[PDB]
Amino acid sequence: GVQVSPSGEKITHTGQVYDEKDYRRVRFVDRQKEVNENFAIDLIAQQPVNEVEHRIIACDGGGGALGHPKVYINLDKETKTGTCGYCGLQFKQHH
Amino acid sequence: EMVRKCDPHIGLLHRGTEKLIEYKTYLQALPYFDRLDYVSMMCNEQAYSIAVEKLLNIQPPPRAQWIRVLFGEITRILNHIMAVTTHALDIGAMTPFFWMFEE
Amino acid sequence: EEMLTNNRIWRNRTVDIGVVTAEDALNYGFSGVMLRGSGIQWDLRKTQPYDVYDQVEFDVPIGSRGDCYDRYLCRVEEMRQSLRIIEQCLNKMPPGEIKVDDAKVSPPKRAEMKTSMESLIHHFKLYTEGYQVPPGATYTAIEAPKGEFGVYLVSDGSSRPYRCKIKAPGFAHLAGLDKMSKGHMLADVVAIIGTQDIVFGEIDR
Amino acid sequence: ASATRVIQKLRNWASGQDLQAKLQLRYQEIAKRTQPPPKLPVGPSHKLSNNYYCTRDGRREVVPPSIIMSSQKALVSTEKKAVTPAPPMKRWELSKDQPYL
Amino acid sequence: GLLKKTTGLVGLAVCDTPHERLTILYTKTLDILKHFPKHAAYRKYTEQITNEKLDMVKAEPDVKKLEALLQGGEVEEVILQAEKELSLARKMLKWKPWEPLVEEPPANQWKWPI
Amino acid sequence: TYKYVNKKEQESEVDMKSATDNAARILMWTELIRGLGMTLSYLFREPATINYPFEKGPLSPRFRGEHALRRYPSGEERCIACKLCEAICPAQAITIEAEPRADGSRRTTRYDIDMTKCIYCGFCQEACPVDAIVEGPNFEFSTETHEELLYNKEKLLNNGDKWEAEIAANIQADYLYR
Amino acid sequence: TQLITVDEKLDITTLTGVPEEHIKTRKVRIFVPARNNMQSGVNNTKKWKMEFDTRERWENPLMGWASTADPLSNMVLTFSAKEDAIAFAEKNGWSYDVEEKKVPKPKSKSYGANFSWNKRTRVSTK
Amino acid sequence: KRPTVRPRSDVTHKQLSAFGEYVAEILPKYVQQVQVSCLDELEICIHPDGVIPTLTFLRDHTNAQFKSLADLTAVDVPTRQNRFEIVYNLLSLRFNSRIRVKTYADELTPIDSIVSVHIAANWYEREVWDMFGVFFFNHPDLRRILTDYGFEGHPFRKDFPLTGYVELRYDDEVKRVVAEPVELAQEFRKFDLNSPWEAFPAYRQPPE
Amino acid sequence: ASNLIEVFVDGQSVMVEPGTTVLQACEKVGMQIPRFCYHERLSVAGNCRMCLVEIEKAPKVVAACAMPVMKGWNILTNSEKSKKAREGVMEFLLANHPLDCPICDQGGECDLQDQSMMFGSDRSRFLEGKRAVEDKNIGPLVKTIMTRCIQCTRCIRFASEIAGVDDLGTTGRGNDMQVGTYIEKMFMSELSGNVIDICPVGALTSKPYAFTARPWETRKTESIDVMDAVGSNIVVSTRTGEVMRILPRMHEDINEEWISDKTR
Amino acid sequence: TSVKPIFSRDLNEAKRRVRELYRAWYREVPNTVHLMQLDITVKQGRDKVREMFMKNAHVTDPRVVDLLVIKGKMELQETIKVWKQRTHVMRFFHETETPRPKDFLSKFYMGHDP
Numbered sequence A: 001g002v003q004v005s006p007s008g009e010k011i012t013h014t015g016q017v018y019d020e021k022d023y024r025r026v027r028f029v030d031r032q033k034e035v036n037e038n039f040a041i042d043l044i045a046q047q048p049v050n051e052v053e054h055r056i057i058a059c060d061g062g063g064g065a066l067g068h069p070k071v072y073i074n075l076d077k078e079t080k081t082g083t084c085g086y087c088g089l090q091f092k093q094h095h
Numbered sequence B: 001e002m003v004r005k006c007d008p009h010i011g012l013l014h015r016g017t018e019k020l021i022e023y024k025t026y027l028q029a030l031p032y033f034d035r036l037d038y039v040s041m042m043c044n045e046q047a048y049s050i051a052v053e054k055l056l057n058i059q060p061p062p063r064a065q066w067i068r069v070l071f072g073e074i075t076r077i078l079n080h081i082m083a084v085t086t087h088a089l090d091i092g093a094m095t096p097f098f099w100m101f102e103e
Numbered sequence C: 001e002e003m004l005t006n007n008r009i010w011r012n013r014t015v016d017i018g019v020v021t022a023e024d025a026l027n028y029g030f031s032g033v034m035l036r037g038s039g040i041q042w043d044l045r046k047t048q049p050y051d052v053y054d055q056v057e058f059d060v061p062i063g064s065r066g067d068c069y070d071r072y073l074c075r076v077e078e079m080r081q082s083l084r085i086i087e088q089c090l091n092k093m094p095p096g097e098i099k100v101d102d103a104k105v106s107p108p109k110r111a112e113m114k115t116s117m118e119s120l121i122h123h124f125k126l127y128t129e130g131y132q133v134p135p136g137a138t139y140t141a142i143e144a145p146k147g148e149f150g151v152y153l154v155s156d157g158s159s160r161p162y163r164c165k166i167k168a169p170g171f172a173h174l175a176g177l178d179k180m181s182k183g184h185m186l187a188d189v190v191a192i193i194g195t196q197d198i199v200f201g202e203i204d205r
Numbered sequence D: 001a002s003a004t005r006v007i008q009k010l011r012n013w014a015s016g017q018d019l020q021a022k023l024q025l026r027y028q029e030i031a032k033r034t035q036p037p038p039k040l041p042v043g044p045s046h047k048l049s050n051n052y053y054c055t056r057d058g059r060r061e062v063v064p065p066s067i068i069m070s071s072q073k074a075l076v077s078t079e080k081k082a083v084t085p086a087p088p089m090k091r092w093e094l095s096k097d098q099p100y101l
Numbered sequence E: 001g002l003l004k005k006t007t008g009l010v011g012l013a014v015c016d017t018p019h020e021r022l023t024i025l026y027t028k029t030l031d032i033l034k035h036f037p038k039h040a041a042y043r044k045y046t047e048q049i050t051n052e053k054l055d056m057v058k059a060e061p062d063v064k065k066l067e068a069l070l071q072g073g074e075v076e077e078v079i080l081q082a083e084k085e086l087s088l089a090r091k092m093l094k095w096k097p098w099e100p101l102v103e104e105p106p107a108n109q110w111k112w113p114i
Numbered sequence F: 001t002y003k004y005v006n007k008k009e010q011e012s013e014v015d016m017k018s019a020t021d022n023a024a025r026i027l028m029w030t031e032l033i034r035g036l037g038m039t040l041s042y043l044f045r046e047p048a049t050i051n052y053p054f055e056k057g058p059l060s061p062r063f064r065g066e067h068a069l070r071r072y073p074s075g076e077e078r079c080i081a082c083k084l085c086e087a088i089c090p091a092q093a094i095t096i097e098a099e100p101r102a103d104g105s106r107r108t109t110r111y112d113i114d115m116t117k118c119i120y121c122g123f124c125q126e127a128c129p130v131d132a133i134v135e136g137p138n139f140e141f142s143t144e145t146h147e148e149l150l151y152n153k154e155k156l157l158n159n160g161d162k163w164e165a166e167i168a169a170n171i172q173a174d175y176l177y178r
Numbered sequence G: 001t002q003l004i005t006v007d008e009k010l011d012i013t014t015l016t017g018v019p020e021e022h023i024k025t026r027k028v029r030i031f032v033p034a035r036n037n038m039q040s041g042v043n044n045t046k047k048w049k050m051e052f053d054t055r056e057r058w059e060n061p062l063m064g065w066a067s068t069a070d071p072l073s074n075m076v077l078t079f080s081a082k083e084d085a086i087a088f089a090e091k092n093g094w095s096y097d098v099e100e101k102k103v104p105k106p107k108s109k110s111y112g113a114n115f116s117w118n119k120r121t122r123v124s125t126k
Numbered sequence H: 001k002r003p004t005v006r007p008r009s010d011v012t013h014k015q016l017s018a019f020g021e022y023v024a025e026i027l028p029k030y031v032q033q034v035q036v037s038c039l040d041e042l043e044i045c046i047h048p049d050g051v052i053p054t055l056t057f058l059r060d061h062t063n064a065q066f067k068s069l070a071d072l073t074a075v076d077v078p079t080r081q082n083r084f085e086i087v088y089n090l091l092s093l094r095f096n097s098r099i100r101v102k103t104y105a106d107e108l109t110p111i112d113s114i115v116s117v118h119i120a121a122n123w124y125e126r127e128v129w130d131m132f133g134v135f136f137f138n139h140p141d142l143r144r145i146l147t148d149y150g151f152e153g154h155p156f157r158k159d160f161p162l163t164g165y166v167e168l169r170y171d172d173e174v175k176r177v178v179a180e181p182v183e184l185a186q187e188f189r190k191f192d193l194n195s196p197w198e199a200f201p202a203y204r205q206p207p208e
Numbered sequence I: 001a002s003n004l005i006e007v008f009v010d011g012q013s014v015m016v017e018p019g020t021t022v023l024q025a026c027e028k029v030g031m032q033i034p035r036f037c038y039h040e041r042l043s044v045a046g047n048c049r050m051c052l053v054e055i056e057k058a059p060k061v062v063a064a065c066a067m068p069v070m071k072g073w074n075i076l077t078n079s080e081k082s083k084k085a086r087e088g089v090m091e092f093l094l095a096n097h098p099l100d101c102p103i104c105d106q107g108g109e110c111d112l113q114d115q116s117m118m119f120g121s122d123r124s125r126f127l128e129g130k131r132a133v134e135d136k137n138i139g140p141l142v143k144t145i146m147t148r149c150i151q152c153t154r155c156i157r158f159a160s161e162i163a164g165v166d167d168l169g170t171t172g173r174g175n176d177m178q179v180g181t182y183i184e185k186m187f188m189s190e191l192s193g194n195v196i197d198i199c200p201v202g203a204l205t206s207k208p209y210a211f212t213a214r215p216w217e218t219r220k221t222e223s224i225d226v227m228d229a230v231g232s233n234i235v236v237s238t239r240t241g242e243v244m245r246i247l248p249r250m251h252e253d254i255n256e257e258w259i260s261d262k263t264r
Numbered sequence J: 001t002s003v004k005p006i007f008s009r010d011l012n013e014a015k016r017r018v019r020e021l022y023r024a025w026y027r028e029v030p031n032t033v034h035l036m037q038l039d040i041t042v043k044q045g046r047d048k049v050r051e052m053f054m055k056n057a058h059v060t061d062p063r064v065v066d067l068l069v070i071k072g073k074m075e076l077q078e079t080i081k082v083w084k085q086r087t088h089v090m091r092f093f094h095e096t097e098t099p100r101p102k103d104f105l106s107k108f109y110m111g112h113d114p
């Protein structure tokens, strides 16, 4: 989530933060640095892994035509989850 | 107040649309035609769409053509309102502008 | 029309103002109402129809005197004829698709784009490269509300136009302002600018 | 809509029209701002067979212009008759709906 | 038939003697055409066009029925066009367009696409 | 078919009745009185003015307004940095950079929209394969400086978090037409 | 109209409105672009191209965008022949470098070589 | 009958082809090429000497009557030695037909003005001079029309850059708008879009 | 001279050496036959079938990449049978291909996308599920997303013939045939990075380059390599003032089509 | 090397037109300084005219000289008509522009441009 650098400036979800000696920090004086606080990397990691009965699962992201292009995920490797390349949801084969 | 010569100087709204279109795809160029006669927007689109359709040797489907005529004639009314009432406004009759701009 | 048409002040400001003869209107490059105000029987929707204009009924208003008042009457009546066309479009609206069923030109529906491999490829390519247009050139014209609106569009075979020359009806009309304003007062010139129905987005481009 | 009957008479008389039948302000006659979902139809190329793209490819049917005459590679050359670009346009008929204003 | 009240076109006045006026202009056009070379195509075709119209004017004494045959609008537009063709013939006599092509273009002048 | 707008020249003789009616019309300004009648009739009509900003002009779910970047219901960003919106943008108003995220995800590190280049055409939201970039319903975002209209990714994601409830409902109402 | 004798190089540089800096200090490259090695299509290796020497791009302090002061940074001109491109550069007063077109060499392909009796062309896999 | 393909008739192609032969036989001194496209549009390509005779013939001849100049423009093709193609688009109301007349020019060879034939050409020729730098002989009043006063160059040439060479701003020291060399906070991003695979075999050029 | 023989490409006469293939004869008239598995610098494979072309008076279409031309053949590269063969083959390639173009680095410089645009149908009639295969880890340079693979075997022929590494092959058969190493193994030749170029699809992509750019963005600067004394010709792809990647630039007398992994 | 002339058959005839245009510009400067209220002397205006003419002193082609004169007459016309504004005339003097130094070292310090 949002952390602060030693200069006190918030660090973004892209890792951006001005140096302490960066003059461009002047632009936030008496104003503010806009930083979205809901990091997608943290929220997607909070989702539980989906357990399925097959070795191929299809993900369209939910909502049918409101999600993402339907893709098929291979679940043969038992040492890791199959992750959807669009929406980041994880799936695992039951056995 | 007798006018001996009219010399219209234009180009005060010349924005180089025609050069810009050369750097656009055909779809990217379409919105430039809304902004030409910007009182008859959809009619400008229709002219450009027909020209592209001709070079593509394709035709739009029947329901699209009826929609395009329907909105072409809505647009013509939009234009003639502006043509008539602002022309009247320049001659001093301000009121028709207001009635017809609510339409 | 109750305010203007028979109003003696309105008639004094538009009758015999900016008279243009039929022959001059043709040689000056006039089109649309700037021709029909002088009695020239010409309208591209009837002579060179496009889309479904040959399937609707309407009348072309024709002037008799070639002045601002006749052109005002032509435009008022053209609005009445537009209502007549709109009514036919409303009743004759057919069913079916609204863009050509040809995914190398028209993008596929979003549901297909998100299901089918071909639709996704064609969606991707149409919004990046765009469709290639076979080489050639056309001069295409319609009866726009301000007159003949034309495009001379050159394709070199690629997905970007090589040349696009736009023919604005008002470009010739304004060029005729000096001709139309001879023997007239400054207040008449204000009327004649209005009678040409001029937008500078199209004249200047 | 809410004008009194007296004011309706006044404005009807003053305009010379029946204004109450064609009010410019919109009331309940217009569409509801929520509608049932549509279900749009599909076009004529939504077929599972007999639908090869090469039989419906308009772009690939475009060909270069026919050279009628060329000072380079194509010579153009009873009395040959004179021709027009097209037949003369027929005169328009006068409207039967309303010929004169 | 009764004489026209207007031609319907601004600036074009009614002709009182259209048959006479057309005969004058067409006959004048055929005279200037005899000064062209016999092989010039402009001569041959314009002679055909003019003779055909001159024979209609001889054939039909009714102005309305003549306008139907000529297919060039009101008879006053036909007269105007007749004067334009005569003016053109005088210019074509000096231009001499029947002569061979003055110059070829560069080889790829008209080649599109490049 | 054609009609004459001002050919009523069937000249006729004039009676005393019609000559007097013509005389009354000229001398008593009767058609000018009809003009006053029309403007009087509007005086007593209810005006069409709405009480902005307490009242608003009607809009539709298709309305193209201020841009936003959306999420999946989990909170994961929808944008996967394909750059279709950037490629199609007729104004080149979009600027994108991307790299593999810490978890390996294909995600943007820059997503800028110059709102003073943008023409609010909606081509980006048509081109997006995942409904990530949309034009929302907001049209009241005028600023006091030019710089405030150069939106970066943080701004655009905050617009998405700010307006998703209305954006989602507008998409539910129109997506079957798309 | 009659002809006149103009025995000098065609040079229209004073009529083009180009600033002097962008005539004399510029270097154009006349070349046929190489095939993009990511694709087998050869349709983009058929025309001659003229492009200008690349100049400084720098970071915009506000947004980080790529800024430039080079008005010719995007200019690309297409030509049907090397000689057309050379002619165009010379009349515009641009110093140019011309690179010869590269055609892939003809190759001998023999599917039967994959199964040779006694040669190293025999493939171990298919 | 093939719903997505544009329907075609042979009647207009035949009519336009025959009129193309007619024009070429009457004006052999000038006509270099005649062609009719599959969009059924006739183009007469002429030597530049023939502009006034050709366009006078098409306006006034009784079987032509192209009395309305729809537009007049140029195309820059840098690979041609005569890089400017001059295009006249003409309309005949009598026969409800259109024709295109094309000639060529280079930077140092003016074209004749056709204002004596169509007064409509007046501003169009000014536009061609302004945008492409092609001079017109015997023009009544030839000068810039779209560009700014004192603007240098012809921006519709292919080798004139999109954003030009100069930009404007108000300078408070001199208290007026001043012209300075163009400097862009974001450079226009050039996209390479062409597919490396051939699209239209009907236009494939000989392998040479 | 005496060995040259006459064939016809759409009726146009061409004189070709004995052994010239149908694909090569069309090249001499400037006609590029569609292909996937064929690569001129690899051994002929003839497995993708995208190059099938009709020969006049012969009822079976021939694989142009492998078929030697015979005297008098008239190759009809644009006949209806040729065109319908290409549509059918393209439809088979796209049936199990993943809907990956937005997330796939090949997008915008993809021969599958482009030859689909130019020679395939515009829609799908495949109403089933799709195959999905697991991904192999072959080192820090090449990312594998093998669900995108189209089994063209270009990588196998490059590794065997150009690089001399017999570690790539196919396992299984039928629709389940998989390109890989079978065991967990690294593909770390000095020429290994060239499989990224020759893989027609996004199955094999550059790990360092991943997700950073799209091909229509990049400006191409043709230049030379200095990592060794070979002087390999390269293209330097840049975007907005930054170097994005290095591609080989063809030069028959130096590096042909390849570069080394240090150069890359 | 056989070309069509525009106006002048040789560079000597073209030089005559150049001198006429120079005279016209020379006489116009005092009227322009006065009517536009420019904050420059008449001498400074005539020195600028001279410098603009000598920017093209190297041209030998009579056709290019013809077109330079044609453009110079146009610029004179929009100056006499007062179609140009003060901003337009003062643009010739580049009064807010820091000129680029001409020596190698100064350009080396500033940046990478030659």
Ligand code: SF4
Pocket: F085, F088, F089, F090, F091, F092, F093, F094, F113, F117, F118, F119, F120, F121, F122, F123, F124, F125, F135
């Ligand atoms: S609305 Fe149009 S102009 Fe604005 S960012 Fe989207 S595509 Fe670009």
Ligand code: SF4
Pocket: F078, F079, F080, F081, F082, F083, F084, F085, F086, F096, F127, F128, F129, F130, F131, F132, F133, I102
């Ligand atoms: S907003 Fe959509 S179109 Fe734009 S880069 Fe992200 S996923 Fe692609």
Ligand code: SF4
Pocket: C121, I097, I098, I099, I100, I101, I102, I104, I105, I106, I107, I108, I110, I111, I112, I113, I148, I200, I201, I202, I203
């Ligand atoms: S390999 Fe080509 S077709 Fe397949 S997902 Fe990638 S870009 Fe799309």
Ligand code: SF4
Pocket: I148, I149, I150, I151, I152, I153, I154, I155, I156, I179, I198, I199, I200, I201, I203, I204
């Ligand atoms: S990984 Fe690529 S090169 Fe190898 S077989 Fe698959 S598609 Fe062909």
Ligand code: FES
Pocket: I034, I035, I036, I037, I038, I045, I046, I047, I048, I049, I050, I051, I052, I063, I064, I065, I066
């Ligand atoms: S290219 Fe010939 S079968 Fe693959």
Ligand code: NA
Pocket: I106, I196, I197, I198, I199, I200, I201, I202, I203, I204, I205
């Ligand atoms: Na690849």
Ligand SMILES: [Zn+2]
Pocket: A059, A060, A061, A068, A084, A085, A086, A087, A088, A089
């Ligand atoms: Zn998913």
